[PDB]
Design a protein around this nucleic acid. Sequence first.
DNA 1: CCTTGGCGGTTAAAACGCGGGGGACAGCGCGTACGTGCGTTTAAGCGGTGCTAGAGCTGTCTACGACCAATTGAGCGGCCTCGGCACCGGGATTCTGAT
DNA 2: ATCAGAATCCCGGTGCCGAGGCCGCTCAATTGGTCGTAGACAGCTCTAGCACCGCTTAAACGCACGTACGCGCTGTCCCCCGCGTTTTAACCGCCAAGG
Lengths: 78, 80, 105, 103, 93, 95, 97, 97
Amino acid sequence: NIQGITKPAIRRLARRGGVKRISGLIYEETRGVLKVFLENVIRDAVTYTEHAKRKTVTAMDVVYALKRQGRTLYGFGG
Amino acid sequence: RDNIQGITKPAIRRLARRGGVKRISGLIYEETRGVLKVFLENVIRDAVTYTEHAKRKTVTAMDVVYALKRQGRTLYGFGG
Amino acid sequence: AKTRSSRAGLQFPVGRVHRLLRKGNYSERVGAGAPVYLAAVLEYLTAEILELAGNAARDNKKTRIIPRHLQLAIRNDEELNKLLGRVTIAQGGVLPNIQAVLLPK
Amino acid sequence: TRSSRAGLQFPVGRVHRLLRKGNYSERVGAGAPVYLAAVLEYLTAEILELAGNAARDNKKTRIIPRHLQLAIRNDEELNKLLGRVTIAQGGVLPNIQAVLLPK
Amino acid sequence: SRKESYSIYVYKVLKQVHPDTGISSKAMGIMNSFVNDIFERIAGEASRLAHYNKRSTITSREIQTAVRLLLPGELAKHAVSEGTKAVTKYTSA
Amino acid sequence: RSRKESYSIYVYKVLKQVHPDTGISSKAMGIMNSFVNDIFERIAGEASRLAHYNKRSTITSREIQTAVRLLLPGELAKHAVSEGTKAVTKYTSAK
Amino acid sequence: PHRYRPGTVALREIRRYQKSTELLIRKLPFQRLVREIAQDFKTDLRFQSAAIGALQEASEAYLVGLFEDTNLCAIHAKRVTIMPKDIQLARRIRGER
Amino acid sequence: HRYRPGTVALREIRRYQKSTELLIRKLPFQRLVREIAQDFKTDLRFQSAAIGALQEASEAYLVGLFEDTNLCAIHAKRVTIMPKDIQLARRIRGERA
DNA sequence: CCTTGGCGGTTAAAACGCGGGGGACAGCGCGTACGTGCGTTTAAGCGGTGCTAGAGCTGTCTACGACCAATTGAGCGGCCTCGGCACCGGGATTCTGAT
DNA sequence: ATCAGAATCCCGGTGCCGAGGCCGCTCAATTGGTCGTAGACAGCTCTAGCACCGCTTAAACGCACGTACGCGCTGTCCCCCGCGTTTTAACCGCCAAGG
């Protein structure tokens, strides 16, 4: 869930994100931003899957979805 | 000639004020000219390339709109 | 009634809409009723823009629409500005944006 | 294919069929598919030339997606090409800011 | 020749929305560009999604889901609601 | 059952030409396929736009030649244009 | 003849610029700048007035947006005056170098 | 023993910017994605490749956002980031209105 | 057959508590250029004005491209036994901090 | 300067799993021949654009008056990490199995 993400996950994300230290409110803000980004991608991906009238959300659906926002992801049949 | 520095100081001051700026540094104008040099370079190069495709030495108002649409700066009210 | 738009309760020409879809290298075939739906959607968008565009024009005691009012209407609304975030409208200017530190105490 | 007689590694006929499949235009000249194949081949050759040297840098022979990502991010024109396109298992080149370093 | 325009169509849209509000030629071109670029976006998405479906034709549900994906949520939903009535009226008549 | 098309051995042979003692992984073949297909998608879209904007139907070598100078930076685009023109001349002169 | 403290007429000028929509920059200097910029790529060119006006409008809009981002950065750093390092911060994050 | 503050964090930055290990584990991320997708349709199967693509895209974008946020925070002579820093980083690109 | 479901469990991933002492932050001093006014310079706004260029449009000739009809060999689907690095055993050398 | 306390990288042994080597394949690329429609050589044109040129009152360069914000200085507040010690879980290690 949104609250299931742990502190060291965001800490190591910041470590790969070039941030040496992040405050307490950064944990909540990062969870919110990650959740809204996930919903933004998932809306398009699930809508594409529904238009195909199929249950299993294929990986290629993200490539079709992230193409709309110009952030296409390679390696999944592009 | 020397038209890069020929842009009047209050014009860039007006542009800074339109960006909601109350105190404007003296180097802001120079930085604005320096950035706008490349900003115009890219778009004009794309437009001239579009014109050069069609054996044209004159830029039409449609080619600029086409280049802006490709780049992601589509302009309204000017056709295209 | 002869035009296909009369039978669909619209006024966009279905023939013109389908003409670009055919001679635009979009697909092998395009539907005939699909242009009706697309024209309905486009007309709804035009009416939606015109509502607040005319409201803004009337509020300034300038009945004739000027591009400044169009820009204000487009960028003031959340949905319209979200659609046209990277879009600049001719002779429209920019949104009045004054923060707290700019205004003197 | 016809790429052998044209001195090109990437076959041209696949490019021609790719152009035909998408219905991007009613007709395409003969020079466009060979030119497109040549451009794609040159770009792939440059990328693989960078990737092979990158693999040799770490005393290695195999290439994983990380090597390709680092090769793309090393150059500036290629980084401009892949400015806002994400690569799976790519990552980011290491970058440590100065003010973060202890004094 | 005869370049097709939306001038009379824009006139009628105003007469259906703001009959007493005037329009300038600049606003005419702005509205023309708006209709044109939204049309291009929807048509391009329809072409891409038709290529995704291994199909050579475009249906109505394809256009509805294109509107849902592209246009903003509330705006897209209202557009779909207004377009379904038009599709039903066209089909029945 | 459909047999798709990829750049599995194409990329491997090009890498062999540029680096004979250099391997590649299973994921990298698919990633290279996606990369080249995306580049081709951009190039085809630009060719269609150039043909339609100039009121044309046949996309000759010149449309792609101009689209490369837009897609690639001036110097890299110049190299790509030179290689493509060489390939076009070789194709036209040969059978 | 009287003088007010700084920050009085500056806000008046800001509101005057924002309220209106006409291009503040004079047409001729910017069109000559565009001519000089274009002369570097291809020589002996002719430029339509509408195209140059479109380029001017796009440049002004982009510069105003960049200056708004610069203002956001300046307020972020507990300041009001804008300096070029704000523009450097904004452009790299935007992705335009 | 107790090191000087900040050195361990930079060492972690250096070792993570060169490693290909997944920072976010698959199970909580998959459960959150499933719960988010269930707001519209229930029992939505997601592929392993689809989940991998989602986590890779999220990590790449959020790492870029942290880099921009660190740039903003450093630009204000600060190291630990703030929600104002995140707001500026997200607003600079143009995603935030 | 590519996806779903269940069932157990453990060291890597991570969770409460002491204490930090450098990092974050409020406030105080100080210097100089930026706000604000006008004096005076300016090539730009606006209007003529002469010329004219090359692209829009059209007559006209049409070359190679989509396609019919047919054809063949190599990249992909699928195998298989061996090698370049996965992975760890155990070692020397460079940092990081305390002194 | 001057010491250790552990941190992380390299050499070597183990080995293993997929990367390529390689065979069958079938369809996709090649291509003889055929007819065509925007493509293109060439011409008519014709007005918006190129370019110059003159007049003038609104905008800009200069510059003083001064003072407040950016930078510096002094001091103060305290907090996610570093670690210690403890926490409990994502995926390994297994199966069935179904839509």
